[PDB]
Amino acid sequence: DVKYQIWKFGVIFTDNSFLYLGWYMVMSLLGHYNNFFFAAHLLDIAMGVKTLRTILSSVTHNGKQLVMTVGLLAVVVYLYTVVAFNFFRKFYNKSEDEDEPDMKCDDMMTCYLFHMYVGVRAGGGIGDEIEDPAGDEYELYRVVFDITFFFFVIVILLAIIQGLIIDAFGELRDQQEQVKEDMETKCFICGIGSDYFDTTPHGFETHTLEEHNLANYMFFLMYLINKDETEHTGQESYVWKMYQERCWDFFPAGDCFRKQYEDQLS
Amino acid sequence: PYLGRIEIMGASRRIERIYFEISETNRAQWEMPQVKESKRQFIFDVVNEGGEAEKMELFVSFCEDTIFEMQIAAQISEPFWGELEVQRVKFLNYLSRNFYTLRFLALFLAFAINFILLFYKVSDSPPNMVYYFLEESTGYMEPALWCLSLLHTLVAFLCIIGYNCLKVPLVIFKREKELARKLEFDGLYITEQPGDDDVKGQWDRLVLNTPSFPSNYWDKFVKRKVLDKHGDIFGRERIAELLGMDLASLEIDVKYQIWKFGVIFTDNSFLYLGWYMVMSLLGHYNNFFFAAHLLDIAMGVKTLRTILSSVTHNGKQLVMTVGLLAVVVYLYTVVAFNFFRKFYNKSEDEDEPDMKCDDMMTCYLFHMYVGVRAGGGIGDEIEDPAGDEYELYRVVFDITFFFFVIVILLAIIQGLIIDAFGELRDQQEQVKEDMETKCFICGIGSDYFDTTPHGFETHTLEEHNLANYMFFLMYLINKDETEHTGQESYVWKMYQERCWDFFPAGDCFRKQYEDQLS
Ligand SMILES: Nc1ncnc2c1ncn2[C@@H]1O[C@H](COP(=O)(O)OP(=O)(O)O)[C@@H](O)[C@H]1O
Ligand SMILES: Nc1ncnc2c1ncn2[C@@H]1O[C@H](COP(=O)(O)OP(=O)(O)O)[C@@H](O)[C@H]1O
Ligand SMILES: [Zn+2]
Ligand SMILES: [Zn+2]
């Protein structure tokens, strides 16, 4: 069946894990061409180690926010670059030798490159790099320039990144806590809270382990699938029909054996 | 689908079901994404900073604003003086329809222009005055920039016009509605009088006498109603002259335009668009003014605006923390100016000393400029104190500066931003939790309705749909009063009296007829 084989191969080749393993095989081939391609397999620790993957989830949880924050930093550095290129061209000379000047803000492209490369990697901003403004008619304007750069880009715009990562840690933690709290508070199948079943000691534990075990529901589906239809009992056939019709009305929703026969049992 | 149902508390003092027809146009307008976003914003605002006392008043006002917006959208939707008028109205409708696409186009043009401006240079010689010329090998970039600047100014003007034709009517409608309510139910200009410090009320004083005071507001009888309410106490001729009404004609507009223009020019979004147009004009004078349009990304991109909300949430705390840093650096400056003047010499050459703490002004400037931008504080900059009688005092000086200013006073800023992230997150979570736990209209929790499977979902989708309440208000407003049924007239009267006692509060059809249904 060549048509079915082609379809299956397309589906397989559109699969992310298979593509990752193929990339692993490709870099392993290229290692023989140049052994240092084997360093691209160290990145497999992120996919392998669950601790590393969980740590990197803090980075990737707010990934779009991080990208937008980097773009915002790029925009604001462009604004500072424009202001420098129009008013502070003299201070950007990075040559001690007077034989040749090396002014780095006589072009918008090179001044933006200089800003994005040194002003954001400097601890004090661009004023760490450029000429001292003391004894100049633009001294107050240039100290405002430098200190606003330091406040907005160095402090605020990296505090945003750190806060995004910290908030990712906290958000993932509270997501896990909320999942655990919901699971241990209400029954998965029927939704009745543990407060109802706790009237009987260990009532919720008994109900979830025995009465409404999702493992038991999975095993019953296995039983139905692997049992011949001719030998299904009445209730087995009823569930089999409801399953073939994709109607999940045989799952007890908000009701249980205890709640139904409370009058008789008590 | 077209059959909407709501529950009200009727004249029989029990919950009742009202059935009415919903138009497909109105349903589509409700499903529109902008209307959905406005609804979500209203829900968040009310749940975060609202209470039960005024929640229904706020909800009714929101419904009225939504109805007016739907009317505007329906009007602008597209199916010798006459020809030019048809051309003008068609053009204005096109602008109103494509306002948001024009705003996106203006943002794209700003990005294109600012990318072109990255090929700029400065030259002393023409291509001691300096010459600014855009250098590019191909040379098509100069005509591209010229045409892009012209097109950008045109698009900004078109954005202003589209705003004036699309969003201004809602501002005027809200203004007139609020004035009518506070004039008829509070006697704002009949008994209370404005406080003379409310510029809003003082300027609204100009529109009472106008022959066309309500023009977007659909309450045509506002003047007659306020006259009937306040005449028997405050006279009738006085009320008639206040409202510009002729009593004789009751039985058997440059002033309004000025008031509307003042209200429009006091509007923040219109002022921002005017500033955009002004900087677009100044771009032709000096192309680099087009870099002030990059700031429009904050107003445009929702992701960027949400990120910047972390900065602006604790803005006053940030400003106060900067002022505190300034005060403490002043204290350190005073201590330096009195005890450590020698160490602040910033000249290697012995020919001339450059001591930077022989004046309080220059020492404060030096501290605020270098000690807070240095990683180790002021001791990174000033002379080493080793082998001096003030060595211990000066190491205490430097290390206290490093601890308090460098560490503590920037950790405060970072903690303010992080706490802003967390606080906004928990605000969103609390709003979602409240909305999914209790019914918006009646307040009965989901625990009650969950006894029936999918009971809360059924109740919120069908029994107490706030969308259904909004649609019923549309139905009442657009239906003639003579053909109102009994319950429709009851709700219409309670609505005209601004009494929200027909909203079922703590009661529902299920809770009322539980005995009979079970
Ligand atoms: N229908 C359900 N079936 C099984 N466990 C349930 C169900 N509803 C709630 N739970 C709860 O799920 C939790 C999972 O614990 P357990 O069943 O021991 O599995 P595991 O430790 O592998 O997660 C228990 O506290 C249990 O009470
Ligand atoms: N009176 C109400 N009308 C509508 N939704 C309500 C009401 N009270 C609570 N809700 C809840 O509001 C939530 C909003 O979801 P939904 O109605 O699908 O709208 P959307 O997804 O656009 O926010 C639902 O979980 C719903 O149960
Ligand atoms: Zn259960
Ligand atoms: Zn309700």
Query: Nearest CB to B121: which of A68, A106, A253?
Result: A106
CA distance A175 to B48: 22
> Which residue is closest to A157 within chain B, CA to CA?
B311
CA end-to-end span of chain A: 64
Phi, psi torsion values for A162, nearest 5 degrees: -65, -40
Q: Which residues contact A149 (CB under 8 A, 6 or more apart)?
A: A80, A119, A125, A126, A127
Left, alpha or beta for B139 (phi > 0: left; psi -120 to 50: alpha)? left
Would you state the structure tokens that stand for residue A225, as one six-digit string? Answer: 């699938």
Find tokens 């045109």 and name the residue. B154
Q: Which residues of chain A have a Cβ shorter than 8 Å from any chain B Cβ? A: 64-65, 68-69, 71-72, 75, 78-79, 82, 85-86, 89, 106-109, 112, 123-125, 127-128, 143, 146-147, 150-151, 155-156, 159-160, 162-164, 166-167, 170-171, 191, 253-254
CB atoms within 10 A of CB A172: 14
Nearest residue (CA) to ligand 1, atom 15:
A184
Which residues make beta-bridge pairs with B17?
Answer: B7
Shortest alpha-carbon distance between residue A163 and chain B (Å): 5
Helix (H) or strand (E) holding A265: helix A262-265
CA distances from B513 to A87, A88, B14, B503, B505 (A): 78, 79, 10, 17, 16
Could you tell me the resolution of this structure in angstroms? 2.9
DSSP letters for B346-374? --S-SSS--BS-SSHHHHHHHIIIIITTS
Which residues make beta-bridge pairs with B46?
Answer: none
With CA atoms as reference, report the closest residue to B9 among B434, B357, B501, B512: B501
User: Do residues A192 and A252 lie in contact, with contact meaning Cβ atoms separated by under 8 Å?
Assistant: no
Task: Provide the residue type at B244 as one letter.
Answer: G
Find tokens 């004023």 and name the residue. A127
Task: Provide the residue type at A27 as one letter.
Answer: M
CA distance B439 to B43: 12
DSSP letters for chain A? -HHHHHHHHHHHHT-HHHHHHHHHHHHHHHHHH-GGGGGGGTTHHHHH-HHHHHHHHHHHHTHHHHHHHHHHHHHHHHHHHHHHHHH--GGGB--S-SSS--BS-SBHHHHHHHIIIIITTSTT-STTTSPP-TTSTTHHHHHHHHHHHIIIIIIIHHHHHHHHHHHHHHHHHHHHHHHHHHHHHB-TTT--BHHHHTTSTTHHHHIIIIIT-HHHHHHHHHHHHHS-GGG--HHHHHHHHHHHTT---SS-SS--HHHHSHHHH-
Tell how many helices (H) and how many strands (E) occur in chain A: 14, 0
Give the number of residues written for chain B. 518
Count how many pairs of residues, chain A against chain B, have C-beta atoms within 8 Å: 103
Contact yes or no for B413 and A155 at CB 8 A: yes
Closest ligand to the CA of B47: 2
> Which residue is closest to B372 within chain A, CA to CA?
A124
Contacts of A125 in chain B (CB under 8 A): 373
Rounding to the nearest 10 degrees, give the CA dihedral for residues B329, B330, B335, B337: 110
> Is A105 labelled as part of a ligand binding site?
no
Find tokens 């923390």 and name the residue. B321
CA distance B174 to B161: 20
Helix (H) or strand (E) holding B255: helix B254-265
Helix (H) or strand (E) holding B133: strand B131-134
Q: How far is CA B402 from the centre of its chain?
A: 41
Half-sphere exposure of B54 (CA within 13 A, CB side): 7
> Is B442 labelled as part of a ligand binding site?
no
User: Do residues B500 and B60 lie in contact, with contact meaning Cβ atoms separated by under 8 Å?
Assistant: yes
Q: Which residues contact B143 (CB under 8 A, 6 or more apart)?
A: none
CA distance A109 to A114: 9
> Sign of the C-alpha dihedral, residues A239, A242, A248, A252?
negative
Helix axes of B254-265 and B268-285: crossing angle, nearest 10 degrees: 80
CA distance A165 to A171: 10
* Technique used by the depositors: cryo-EM
CA distance B200 to B184: 17
**Rounded (5°) CA angle B265-B57-B219:** 60
User: Do residues B183 and B226 lie in contact, with contact meaning Cβ atoms separated by under 8 Å?
Assistant: yes
